[PDB]
């Protein structure tokens, strides 16, 4: 009967003032979480950072936005006990490199431009979620996986159905089984004709050792696609809405287009999508913030609270794209820190730069209070985002 976690905010566009008092008084405390179980709630920036850094806490339940009901071992990272996590991550990171992510900029520009061509070809108003936020990220992954333009239609549909919710338990599993089939065939085809893509590169990676089999490759491909899709789509949808509901910051961006990178980092901090780190368990006794956490006890990082700690940034409640980017914890920290963060940053940069440039006078087609948020314990995004432009 530890107290329930205080609600941080009623809307992602507001400061999370509801968690401030706990963070200030007790940055490591006991709370009861939505499942009805108690765990250590960690909200201070310093302590969340120290928790994520410490391999004494192993992940039991991954970050909520990186998993689907829903899907489908070695190569998945998310659902991986140690020491396989470490070695499988090292294998994947050998080919899914920051270099490979940077190398996708022209692909990302192309994809973003293609989606905006379709949008302005039709006008006006459009739902930015269906036409853009949900569509772009899976097509970037399609390119990462070497999917021919053919070929994209099928990939988009299957990935889309995977995100769909609401779909019933069955419908949900059937979507997962179709994705599984697609990915299995994809792996066979890349074996049959290798290319310059990530899957081809893994098939051919240094593997002493022999862990990279078809199962490993399906697990990695599924994980990256699923992890990249709802996270990035949420950032695009909520980030666009937050900018549109912040005419002060939008004006600063329009006055100084070089702020796009700063704006992406501030949106990441401000929204801290998913709110919590994956639930961890102590594999040994550990002292965190002066508090003894016993082996076997659960620990939940309140990353949103950490990203609003006044010890971390000044006047944290302010949404201010002029800030020099600070090391927020929206991509985590330590061993499980987000492996796709450079890709996410690159995609959001191209997305926001192109959107606001190509659709001058972009604005909400309906007041903000009419937006409908996907919320299930935490916010997953907006259902639709009706927009117009000049």
- Stretch 255-274: interaction string toward ligand HEM, x if CB under 6 A: ------------------x-
* Cβ atoms of 293 and 285 closer than 8 Å: yes
Out of 8, 28, 52, 64, name the contact with ligand HEM by CB under 6 A. 52
Contacts of 123 (CB under 8 A, 6+ apart): none
DSSP 8-state class, residue 3: P
Out of 219, 223, 249, 262, name the contact with ligand HEM by CB under 6 A. 223
Half-sphere exposure of 311 (CA within 13 A, CB side): 13
Q: What is the dihedral of CA 93, 132, 61, 176, to 10 degrees?
A: -90
Given the structure tokens 């310059």, which residue do they identify? 196
Tell me if residue 312 falls in helix, strand or coil.
Answer: coil
Bridge partners, 31 (sequence order): 39
Out of 227, 260, 350, 364, name the contact with ligand HEM by CB under 6 A. 227
Nearer to ligand HEM among residue 190 and residue 336 (C-beta): 336
Q: Of residues 79-108, which lie at the interface with ligand HEM (CB under 6 A)?
A: 89
Given the structure tokens 């199962």, which residue do they identify? 215
Q: Does 129 bind ligand HEM (CB under 6 A)?
A: no
Q: Does 242 bind ligand HEM (CB under 6 A)?
A: no
Q: Does 240 bind ligand HEM (CB under 6 A)?
A: no
Q: Does 78 bind ligand HEM (CB under 6 A)?
A: yes
Beta strand 373-376 with 378-382 is antiparallel
* Cβ atoms of 180 and 161 closer than 8 Å: no
Nearer to ligand HEM among residue 22 and residue 273 (C-beta): 273
Q: Does 159 bind ligand HEM (CB under 6 A)?
A: no
Task: Find the shortest distance in angstroms from Cβ 236 to ligand HEM.
Answer: 9
Q: 85: annotated binding-site residue?
A: yes
Tell me if residue 370 falls in helix, strand or coil.
Answer: helix
Q: Does 19 bind ligand HEM (CB under 6 A)?
A: no
Stretch that binds ligand HEM, among 128-136, 239-247, 254-262, 337-345 (CB under 6 A): 337-345
Nearer to ligand HEM among residue 21 and residue 34 (C-beta): 34
The residue count for binding ligand HEM (CB under 6 A) is 27
Beta strand 38-42 with 373-376 is unpaired
Q: Does 224 bind ligand HEM (CB under 6 A)?
A: yes
Task: Find the shortest distance in angstroms from Cβ 342 to ligand HEM.
Answer: 9
Out of 64, 187, 343, 382, name the contact with ligand HEM by CB under 6 A. 343
Out of 344, 346, 385, 387, name the contact with ligand HEM by CB under 6 A. 344
Q: 37: annotated binding-site residue?
A: no
DSSP 189-219: HHHHS--SSHHHHHHTS--TT---SHHHHHH
Q: Does 316 bind ligand HEM (CB under 6 A)?
A: no
**How many Cβ atoms are within 10 Å of 145's Cβ, its own excluded?**
20
* Breaks after residues in the chain, judged by C–N over 2.5 Å: 72
Out of 51, 59, 64, 163, name the contact with ligand HEM by CB under 6 A. 59
Q: 66: annotated binding-site residue?
A: yes
Angle of helix 136-144 relative to helix 341-358, nearest 10 degrees, comes to 130
**How many Cβ atoms are within 10 Å of 1's Cβ, its own excluded?**
6
Out of 50, 51, 77, 242, name the contact with ligand HEM by CB under 6 A. 77
Q: Does 162 bind ligand HEM (CB under 6 A)?
A: no
Q: Which two tokens stand for residue 87?
A: 């070695």
Residue ranges of the binding site:
66, 85, 89, 278, 280, 336, 338
Residue ranges of the binding site for heme b:
66, 85, 89, 278, 280, 336, 338
């Amino acid at each position: 009967d530890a107290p329930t976690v205080p609600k941080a905010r009623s809307c992602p566009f507001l400061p999370p003032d509801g968690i401030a008092d706990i963070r200030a008084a007790a940055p490591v405390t006991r709370a009861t979480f939505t499942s009805g179980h108690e765990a250590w709630l960690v909200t201070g920036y310093e302590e969340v950072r120290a928790l994520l850094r410490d391999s004494s806490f192993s992940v039991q339940v991954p970050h909520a936005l990186h998993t689907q009901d829903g899907v489908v071992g070695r190569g998945s990272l998310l659902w991986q006990d140690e020491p396989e996590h470490t070695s499988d991550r090292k294998l994947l990171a050998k080919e899914f490199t920051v270099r490979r992510m940077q190398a996708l900029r022209p692909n990302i520009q192309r994809i973003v431009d293609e989606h905006l061509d379709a949008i302005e070809a039709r006008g006006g108003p459009v739902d930015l979620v269906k036409t853009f936020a949900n569509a772009v990220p899976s097509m970037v992954i399609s390119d990462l996986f070497g999917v021919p333009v053919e070929r994209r239609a099928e990939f988009q549909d299957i990935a889309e159905a995977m995100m769909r919710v609401d779909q019933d338990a069955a419908a949900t599993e059937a979507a997962g089984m179709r994705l599984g089939g697609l990915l299995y065939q994809l792996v066979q085809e890349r074996r049959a004709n290798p290319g310059d893509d990530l899957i081809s590169a893994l098939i051919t990676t240094e593997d002493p050792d022999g862990v990279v089999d078809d199962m490993f490759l399906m697990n990695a491909a599924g994980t990256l696609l699923i992890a990249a899709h709802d996270t990035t789509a949420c950032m695009i949808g909520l980030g666009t809405a937050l900018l549109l509901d912040s005419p002060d910051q939008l004006a600063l961006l329009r006055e100084d287009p070089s702020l796009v990178g700063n704006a992406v980092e501030e949106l990441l901090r401000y929204l801290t999508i998913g709110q919590f780190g994956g639930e961890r368990v102590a594999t040994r006794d550990v002292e965190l913030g002066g508090v003894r956490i016993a082996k076997g006890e659960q620990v939940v990082a309140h990353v949103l609270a950490a990203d609003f700690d006044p010890a971390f940034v000044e006047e944290p409640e302010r949404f201010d794209i002029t800030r020099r980017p600070a090391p927020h914890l929206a991509f985590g920290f330590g061993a499980h820190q987000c492996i796709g963060q450079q890709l996410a940053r690159i995609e959001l940069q191209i997305v926001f730069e192109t959107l606001f440039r190509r659709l001058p006078g972009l604005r909400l087609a309906k007041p903000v209070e009419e937006l409908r948020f996907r919320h299930d314990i935490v916010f997953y995004g907006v259902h639709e985002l009706p927009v117009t432009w000049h």
